[PDB]
Amino acid sequence: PQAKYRHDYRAPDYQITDIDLTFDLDAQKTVVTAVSQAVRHGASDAPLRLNGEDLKLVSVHINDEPWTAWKEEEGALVISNLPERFTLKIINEISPAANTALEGLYQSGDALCTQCEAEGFRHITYYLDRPDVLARFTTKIIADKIKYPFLLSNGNRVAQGELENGRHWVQWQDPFPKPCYLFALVAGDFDVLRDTFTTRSGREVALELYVDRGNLDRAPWAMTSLKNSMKWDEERFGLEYDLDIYMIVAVDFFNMGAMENKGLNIFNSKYVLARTDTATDKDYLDIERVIGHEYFHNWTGNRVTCRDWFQLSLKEGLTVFRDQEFSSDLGSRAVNRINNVRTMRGLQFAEDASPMAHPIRPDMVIEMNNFYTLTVYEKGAEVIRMIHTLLGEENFQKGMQLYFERHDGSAATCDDFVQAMEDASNVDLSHFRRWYSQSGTPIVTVKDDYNPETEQYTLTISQRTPATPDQAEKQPLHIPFAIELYDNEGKVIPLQKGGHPVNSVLNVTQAEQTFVFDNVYFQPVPALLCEFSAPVKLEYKWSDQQLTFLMRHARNDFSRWDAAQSLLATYIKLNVARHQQGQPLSLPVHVADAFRAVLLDEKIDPALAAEILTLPSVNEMAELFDIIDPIAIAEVREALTRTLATELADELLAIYNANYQSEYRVEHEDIAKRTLRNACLRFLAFGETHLADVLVSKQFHEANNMTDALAALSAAVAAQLPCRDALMQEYDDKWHQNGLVMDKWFILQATSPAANVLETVRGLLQHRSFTMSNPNRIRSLIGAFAGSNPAAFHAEDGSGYLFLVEMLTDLNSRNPQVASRLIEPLIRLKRYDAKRQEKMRAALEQLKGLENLSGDLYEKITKALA
Ligand code: NA
Ligand code: NA
Ligand SMILES: [Zn+2]
């Protein structure tokens, strides 16, 4: 297929202002009637080009006159000789049961539901499928009453009828103009959890949460989380819901996580259903994060939408930012920041070095569903967070207000948003805008000098962005670079220049610059890039002692964690080198002492201690190398864990027992203690083998909740403990009837350190709880194997690569979106050694030759092979 370019955006030749949809629903054959009110803005000789994919066109009318001046082309219906204003009427057929891709109107179990973002509405009827076309929708739905007792669409339900032959109908009307991507429709049978929420200004909102029959007992957390989201948006952003009714439907077959369709969010049931015996703390916090995210989209995405898809980050970065602020307000800000920074450096940096690298605002897109990315979302959010960092909360809030005042009811661009922040705040963001147009990870180098004569500290900070596959020309960014200076007793030294205060966020705007601070009364240990103030790799020659100093004294929790990460990074590299030469782990005692100090600091938040005692993941430490040796990294993570487990066995078991809790609560203090406790258990599982088998076996049989059961089952697999197969068998036997719970188990299989893991994963393709048609099962088994087991995926014999090729050969035909998610590990080939490159390259070449190669794979495969 063929690329679209951001610089080619033009306002459309036509607008639609109102559309009236009728659906005569049936899974085999749905008939859609679509009456649209349209207007020509372009030249009269310019036809109306309607997108449509896999539609059967039954008829076309223009002001009620059967139209003869039209034709069908590659994925469009083109209509000529139109007046300036007219009513378009289209009747077409689609087939939901055939729709395995889950784009458009498909079937999720017995239910019918939709997914329209980015360009799925065109799989439902011929339309102007692009988000700068906003219209008022009215949606009539007709269906078999026994099979589809609930019939849902956006807005308010405004009519209702029965018919002969056991069929009934409902009609919905949504007063707010929207682009078609936000359209949704659900038909099916559900248990419904109903509650209400009263807004800050008194508006009462009905809340309805639709789940499969039987699951009303895993719903209340999601409902609570929705309410918390609604309250928080009021408190922090001053934003209230704008309709009478908030529906959420939880379906099992879903490609995204969840989707912000106006007043009728549709969710992967993974990000709704929770019970203490089925869901972990991390699940609960995820459901919270995702429910909030779709809710915050009501303003940042719906009330103001995107002019074109290249502007995706206008809504995703800002809505991710909003979900992060919500989680951090209600829980631990530091733990939140830490985890978000682990994601940026672990996963996102890799993408920004890959064939798939793009700016948060892409300039070129072949298939748009390939741009729902770590970059657009997470880096997007970091870019928003830099704006916040430059402006401060009061000014950032004024920008939000101006953004809405200007663009409420319309579609906007990244630049529009950046301008609202500029105009409202008076901070100049012209240079800052470069963050939107430039790909890749900047590298910020820092050199320092202390001068005891003058009591001056000098930072020489310089920056470069290396070239990326997608751009050859790079330039300096506007980098907000936050610092704190610590004196010898751990107290902050004030930042001054010429005896006037100086702001602790430094504007690093040039390729190289020098900052000088006065009255530095003692040689400082610096905290640099404080709270990851910009998404950059930092290069500074730390001594280990500076790093341990920060772990004990730094005032910002995040810096303590981050210093520990920098400390470990040196020894991860050292030990990967040692591994390559057949040597055992080397690890100085002072390093171990530093981590002992954290464990027995009784004034440190247990959640912080827990993150500090969580080792970088294999992906996070792969970022430290040019060539990745994934076997070495895995083997090194294992060894480093054993070593600490031996070195700190007594403290670890003490803290493990100290944070035992008889009550289970989903409350931030309790989650912290359970997180620390289970981090301690993870180490002990890599220690004395009998004690391990006992603790891990006992915890598994004696929880209480899924957080503690999985933490133990998971150590049993990681450390290959004697009790493992039995625990894995209990779990299967209990939980097999339940996919969302089985997903955890598949992930564990797929990420097993054991020897024949691939052979196992293959066989699990036949497991009772696995199915190739459910994106969740695919992501847990196959996706976890390829993405999170790089020691087995990258076996020297190329067997992991061919396994993926098999799976992709299937999924390219079945579900291109899921397939594109799965291919990502294979297009990282240039970070591996030559032998691995050749084989990976070979596998991409095999997939490049598939009949009916999907656009989604195509785009990634050609970039990887270029
Ligand atoms: Na319009
Ligand atoms: Na907080
Ligand atoms: Zn979003």
As a three-state string, the secondary structure of 338-406 is HHHHHHHHHHHHHHCCCCCCCCCCCCEECCHHHHCCHHHHHHHHHHHHHHHHHHHHHHHHHHHHHHHHH
Q: What is the token pair recorded at 243?
A: 């309709």
Helices (H) and strands (E) in the chain, counts: 29, 35
What's at 853, amino acid-wise? L
Stretch (H or E) spanning 733: helix 724-735
Question: 276: helix, coil or strand?
Answer: coil
Rounded CA-CA distance 843/853 in Å is: 14
The set of residues, in sequence order, having a beta carbon less than 8 Å from that of 637 and lying 6+ positions away, is 615, 616, 618, 621
Q: Is the dihedral of CA 665, 668, 670, 674 positive or negative?
A: positive
Q: Are 109 and 252 in contact (CB under 8 A)?
A: yes
Q: How crowded is residue 373: how many other Cβ atoms within 10 Å of its Cβ?
A: 22
Q: Which two tokens stand for residue 51?
A: 């997108």
Using only the alpha carbons of the chain, give its radius of gyration: 28
711, two tokens = 């933490």
Which amino acid is residue 667, in one-letter code?
A: E
Structure-token match 């999170």, residue found:
788
Helix axes 220-232, 281-296, angle to 10 degrees: 50
Phi then psi for residue 313, to 5 deg, are -60, -20
Cα 264 from Cα 118, distance rounded (Å)? 17
Cα angle 88, 92, 98; round to 5:
150
Q: 106 - beta bridge partners? A: 113
Locate all alpha helices (DSSP H) within 527-587, ordered by sequence: 544-553, 557-580
Token code pair at residue 363: 């300039």
Q: What are phi and psi of 50, to 5 degrees?
A: -105, 130
The two structure tokens encoding residue 474: 């790079």
**Closest-approaching ligand to the CA atom of 314:** 3
CA of 326 to the centre of ligand 3 (A): 14
Number of C-alpha atoms within 13 angstroms, CB side, residue 759?
3
To the question of whether residue 623 is assigned a binding role by annotation, the answer is no
Whether residue 297 is annotated as binding a ligand: the answer is yes
**Please, what are the domains in the chain?**
11-190 (2.60.40.1730), 191-275 (3.30.2010.30), 276-439 (1.10.390.10), 440-541 (2.60.40.1840), 542-866 (1.25.50.10)
* Helix residue ranges per DSSP H, 91-237: 220-232
Q: Which residues contact 863 (CB under 8 A, 6 or more apart)?
A: 355, 356, 469, 827
Q: 10 Å Cβ neighbour count for 35?
A: 16
590 is in an annotated binding site: no
Q: How far is CA 711 from the centre of its chain?
A: 23
Instruction: Mark out the alpha helices in 414-556 (DSSP H runs).
Output: 414-425, 434-437, 544-553
240 is in an annotated binding site: no
Give the pair of three-digit tokens for residue 541: 């020659």
3-state helix, strand, coil in the chain (%, to 5): 45, 20, 35
If you write DSSP's letter for every residue of 303-347 in order, what string do you get?
TBEESSGGGHHHHHHHHHHHHHHHHHHHS-HHHHHHHHHHHIIII
Dist. CA 320 → ligand 3 center (Å): 7
* CA dihedral sign, ordered 788, 789, 791, 794: negative
What determination technique applies here? X-ray
| DSSP reduced 3-state for 722 | coil
Token look-up 């089985």 returns 742
Length of the chain: 866
What is the identity of the amino acid at 499?
G
Q: What is the rounded distance in angstroms from the CA atom of residue 788 to the CA atom of residue 785?
A: 6
H or E element at residue 40 = strand 30-40
* Other beta carbons less than 10 A from residue 845's beta carbon: 12
Centre of ligand 3 from the C-alpha of residue 313, in Å: 9
Q: Find out whether 679 is annotated in a ligand binding site.
A: no
End-to-end CA distance of the chain: 16
Dihedral of the CA atoms 463, 466, 472, 476 (nearest 10)?
A: -10
Place of tokens 């990887």: 864
CA distance 316 to 322: 9
Torsion of CA 699, 701, 706, 712, to 10 degrees: 40
The label of the residue with tokens 């989707």 reads: 259
Catalytic residues: 294
Alpha helices in 167-278 (DSSP H): 220-232
Strands, sheet with 56-62, edge to edge from the N-terminal-most edge strand: 65-66, 56-62, 85-94, 30-40, 14-24, 135-144, 167-178, 156-163
CA atoms of 811 and 813, how far apart (whole Å): 5
Question: 623, 572 in Cβ contact below 8 A?
Answer: no
Report the separation in Å between the CA atom of 363 and the middle of ligand 3, taken as the mean of its atom positions.
20
Closest ligand to the CA of 334: 2
Using N-to-C axis directions, what is the helix angle for 724-735 and 706-718, rounded to 10°? 140
Amino acid at 317: G
Task: Give the Cα separation of 387 and 378 in Å (integer).
Answer: 14
Distance 134 CA to ligand 1 centre (A): 4
Which ligand has the shortest distance to the CA of 127? Answer: 1
User: How far apart are alpha carbons 596 and 651 in whole angstroms?
Assistant: 7
- 342 Cα: distance to centroid of ligand 2 (angstroms): 19
The residue written with tokens 């805008």 in the block is 433
User: Which pair of tokens denotes residue 673?
Assistant: 């203690």
Q: Among 263, 264, 284, 260, which residue's Cα sits nearest to residue 272? A: 284
Contact between 572 and 621 under an 8 Å Cβ cutoff? The reply is yes
Q: Is 706 helix (H, G, I), strand (E, B) or coil?
A: helix
742/731 Cα distance (integer angstroms): 8
Residues 265 and 249 sit within 8 Å (Cβ to Cβ): yes
Kindly identify the ligand whose nearest atom is closest to the C-alpha of 117.
3
What residue type is 460 in one-letter code?
T
Would you tell me how many other CB atoms lie within 10 Å of the CB of residue 496? 13
Closest by CA to 831, choosing from 625, 581, 631, 634, is: 625
Q: Find out whether 316 is annotated in a ligand binding site.
A: yes
Give which of 295, 438, 440, 321 is closest to 384, Cα–Cα: 321
Among all chains, which residue has been given the structure tokens 């940026």? 344
State this model's resolution in angstroms.
2.8
Q: Which two tokens stand for residue 44?
A: 């009269």
Residue 622, exposed/middle/buried by CB under 10 A (0-12, 13-18, 19+)? buried
- Give the Cα separation of 680 and 614 in Å (integer): 9
Tokens representing 203 are: 């508006």
Distance 488 CA to ligand 2 centre (A): 30
Ligand at shortest distance from the CA of 11 = 1
Q: Phi, psi (5° rounding) for residue 413?
A: -115, 165
The encoded tokens of residue 163 equal 């018919």
In the numeric block, which tokens belong to residue 118?
């980015």
Beta strands 185-188 and 150-153 are: antiparallel
Residues near ligand 2 ion, CB 5 Å cutoff: 333
317 CA distance to ligand 3 middle (Å): 8
Residue 293 in marked binding region: yes
